[PDB]
């Protein structure tokens, strides 16, 4: 996140850090002790999953290390996108979602907790928060340092649709920021968007340039994916 603030330590205890070979790749959400939800463009051949983190730049006692046993992509994700190192600003984020099954269940602590799925549609005008470690340095270090947060307002989708109207679907949300001061970065992918205290969106931004909240769809909407998320967990735990 660019233009945010350092979150209170352990205030986002569902926040995941996904690494590959010691290099930070993206965020994610712990949605069940055995499951992380993140973006499909964050697929890799060897996951290192970290729960309970705050400052990625140092060792932390609350940190919990996990490997992954299986990956499940939204079946409607266009698999040809996986060949690209970076998605394009016009690429559809509707189905850019993946569930990672943890080899061993997370231990629930003050620092490591699940985030419940939404039980109602989000209201326009609600206050939202998202979190992540994504840096502007997307070619060299995708995430480091302390977990950042930003406050947003949930808006009608058309407010985010002007640059790429084709990205406006039933599977996205529009959450704006006070001025042109805030952007989301690739490494923020997988971060929860929590609106009026409910998990409603998840960051899915795969391009190398960071995105202003006000001009782009960067959050995949969780509600239309509930059946698939819940059924995948039920069938594969």
From Swiss-Prot:
Residues carrying a glycan: 55
Protein name: Kallikrein-1E2
Keyword set includes DNA repair: no
Protein's gene: KLK1E2
Distribution of this protein across tissues and organs: Detected in prostate and semen.
Disulfide bonds: 7-149, 26-42, 128-195, 160-174, 185-210
Predominant location category: secreted
InterPro entries recorded: Peptidase_S1_PA (IPR009003), Peptidase_S1_PA_chymotrypsin (IPR043504), Peptidase_S1A (IPR001314), Trypsin_dom (IPR001254), TRYPSIN_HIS (IPR018114), TRYPSIN_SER (IPR033116)
């Amino acid at each position: 996140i660019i233009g945010g603030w350092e979150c209170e330590k352990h205030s986002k205890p569902w926040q995941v850090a996904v690494y590959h070979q010691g290099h930070f790749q993206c965020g994610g959400v712990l949605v069940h002790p055995q499951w992380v939800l993140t973006a499909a463009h964050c697929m890799s051949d060897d996951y290192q999953i970290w729960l309970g983190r705050h400052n990625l730049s140092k060792d932390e006692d609350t940190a919990q290390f996990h490997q992954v046993s299986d990956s499940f992509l939204d079946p409607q994700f266009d698999l040809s996108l996986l060949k690209k190192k970076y998605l394009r600003p016009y690429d559809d984020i509707s189905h850019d979602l993946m569930l990672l099954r943890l080899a061993q269940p997370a231990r629930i602590t003050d620092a490591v907790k699940i985030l419940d799925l939404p039980t109602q549609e989000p209201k326009l005008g609600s206050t939202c928060y998202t979190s992540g470690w994504g840096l502007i340095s997307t070619f060299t270090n995708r995430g480091s340092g302390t977990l950042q947060c930003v406050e947003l307002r949930l808006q009608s989708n058309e407010k985010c649709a002007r640059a790429y109207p084709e990205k406006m679907t039933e599977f996205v949300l529009c959450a704006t920021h006070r001025d042109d001061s805030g952007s989301i970065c690739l490494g923020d992918s997988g971060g929860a968007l929590i609106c009026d205290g409910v998990f409603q969106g998840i960051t899915s931004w795969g391009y190398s340039e960071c995105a202003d909240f006000n001009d782009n769809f960067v959050f995949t909407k969780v509600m239309p994916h509930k059946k698939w998320i819940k059924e995948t967990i039920e069938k594969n735990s």
